[PDB]
């Protein structure tokens, strides 16, 4: 069995290997990459996403979100307070202000220590889930707006044609902006490209061990767990690496830098934080191997998770027994 310790693997494809996206994902899996839940892909030196980032300041962040924490430094939830619209140039200025800017630090490990010590005492503002793309239309390789759609994959594997679309999303971050512990909708894959700016640190639990994280989360967030049998779908709970280690939860960590891709694999729980002002692009995708995970994915039906239009068909076809309860939670 390849990668039996479930380490995060880093890949350096050649320009020739960068042509066929599906083939390369399958290659990474042949080497055991999925066992970690997360892999890094460093593009060949010949590749670029676009020519420059000099002309992005006029993108609008219609609903910036202030991430307010509650709890203790290593075990907390966050809620998202809506703020007034601002442009990417305005948001960049805010991220660099004395109130929000990255503090002085020695290295990524020192900054990680500072994050976990101090995160809860601040409320950073995140531009999330902005439909759009920064890939140039002429970028032919690993262009996240030109991937094969999940609806086409389901039709190819299973024979059923379904409604829905699959487009990318932009994220504008600042110091301490946080992504809570989660798997993807319907336990899909994700791919994330860090277009510019400061790093993103990731934590991940191997898919084979995801239920260990879920059991800890139920213990640590006992009211939330009574409220919903899949409350991590709410995407609000944080648990630090120190707390994970104290509770024996298997996990790994890695820092993504500008110009690098990360892939999350089906049922790979992940969480993390941004080091400073940055911009990332991400999208969900599927392969044949996903279908069995989609059939078994948990679902939130309490009303909190609320998701895209295109998840309806996935539940309807892959999980017909759950569909009526889930759809009630959507309405
Ligand atoms: O970068 C972020 O805030 C969160 N991204 C992801 O969870 C992802 O790409 O799957
Ligand atoms: Mg612009
Ligand atoms: Ni994710
Ligand atoms: Zn719920």
Curated annotation (Swiss-Prot):
Membrane spanning stretches: none
Note accompanying the cofactor annotation: Binds 1 Fe(2+) ion per subunit.
Binding locations of Zn(2+): 228, 234, 300, 302
Annotated 2-oxoglutarate binding sites: 126, 192, 200, 235
Residues of the JmjN domain: 8-50
Top-level taxon: Eukaryota
Taxonomic lineage: Eukaryota, Metazoa, Chordata, Craniata, Vertebrata
Organism: Homo sapiens (Human)
Gene name, Swiss-Prot/TrEMBL: KDM4D
Main location: nucleus
Protein name: Lysine-specific demethylase 4D
Cofactor: Fe(2+)
Binding-site residues for Fe cation, renumbered to this chain: 182, 184, 270
The EC number(s) this enzyme carries: 1.14.11.66
Gene Ontology MF: a single term: histone demethylase activity
Function: Histone demethylase that specifically demethylates 'Lys-9' of histone H3, thereby playing a central role in histone code. Does not demethylate histone H3 'Lys-4', H3 'Lys-27', H3 'Lys-36' nor H4 'Lys-20'. Demethylates both di- and trimethylated H3 'Lys-9' residue, while it has no activity on monomethylated residues. Demethylation of Lys residue generates formaldehyde and succinate.
GO cellular component terms, semicolon-separated: blood microparticle; chromatin; nucleoplasm; nucleus; pericentric heterochromatin; site of double-strand break
Parent sequence residues shown: 11 to 341 of 523
Reaction catalysis annotation: N(6),N(6),N(6)-trimethyl-L-lysyl(9)-[histone H3] + 2 2-oxoglutarate + 2 O2 = N(6)-methyl-L-lysyl(9)-[histone H3] + 2 formaldehyde + 2 succinate + 2 CO2
Class of this enzyme: oxidoreductase
GO biological process: cellular response to ionizing radiation; chromatin remodeling; double-strand break repair via homologous recombination; inflammatory response; positive regulation of chromatin binding; positive regulation of double-strand break repair via nonhomologous end joining; regulation of gene expression; regulation of protein phosphorylation
Compartments where located: Nucleus
Record's keyword terms, sorted: ADP-ribosylation, Chromatin regulator, Dioxygenase, Iron, Metal-binding, Nucleus, Oxidoreductase, Transcription, Transcription regulation, Ubl conjugation, Zinc
Residues the record lists as PolyADP-ribosyl glutamic acid modifications: 16-17
Protein family (similarity comment): Belongs to the JHDM3 histone demethylase family.
PTM text: Ubiquitinated via 'Lys-63'-linked ubiquitin chains. Deubiquitinated by USP14 with the help of TRIM14 leading to stabilization.
JmjC domain residues: 136-302
């Amino acid at each position: 069995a390849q990668n039996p310790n479930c380490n995060i693997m880093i890949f350096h494809p050649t320009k020739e290997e960068f042509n066929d996206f599906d083939k390369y994902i399958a290659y990474m899996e042949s080497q055991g990459a999925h066992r970690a839940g997360l892999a890094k892909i460093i593009p060949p030196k010949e590749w670029k996403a676009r020519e420059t980032y000099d002309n992005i300041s006029e993108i609008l962040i219609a609903t910036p979100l202030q991430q307010v924490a509650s709890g203790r430094a290593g075990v907390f939830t966050q809620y998202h307070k809506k703020k007034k619209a601002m442009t990417v140039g305005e948001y960049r200025h805010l991220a660099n202000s004395k109130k929000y800017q990255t503090p002085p630090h020695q290295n990524f490990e020192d900054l990680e220590r500072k994050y976990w010590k101090n995160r809860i005492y601040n409320s950073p503002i995140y531009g999330a889930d902005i439909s759009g793309s920064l890939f140039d239309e002429n970028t032919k390789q690993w262009n996240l707006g030109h991937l094969g759609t999940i609806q086409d994959l389901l039709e190819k594997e299973c024979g059923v044609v379904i409604e829905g679309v699959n487009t990318p999303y932009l994220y504008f971050g600042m110091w301490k902006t946080t992504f809570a512990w989660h798997t993807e909708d319907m336990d899909l894959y994700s791919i994330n490209y860090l277009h510019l700016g400061e790093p993103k640190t990731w934590y991940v639990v191997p898919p084979e061990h995801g239920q260990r994280l879920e059991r800890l989360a139920r213990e640590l967030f006992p009211g939330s767990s009574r409220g919903c049998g899949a409350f991590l779908r709410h995407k609000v709970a944080l648990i630090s690496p120190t707390v994970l280690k104290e509770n024996g939860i298997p996990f790994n960590r890695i820092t993504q830098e500008a110009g690098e891709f990360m892939v999350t694999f089906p049922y790979g729980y992940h969480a993390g934080f941004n080091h400073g002002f940055n911009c990332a692009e991400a999208i969900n995708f599927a392969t044949p191997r996903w279908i069995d995970y989609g059939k078994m994915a948990s679902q939130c039906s309490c009303g909190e998770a609320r998701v895209t239009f295109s998840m309806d068909a996935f539940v309807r076809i892959l999980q017909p027994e759950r569909y009526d309860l889930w759809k009630r939670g959507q309405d």
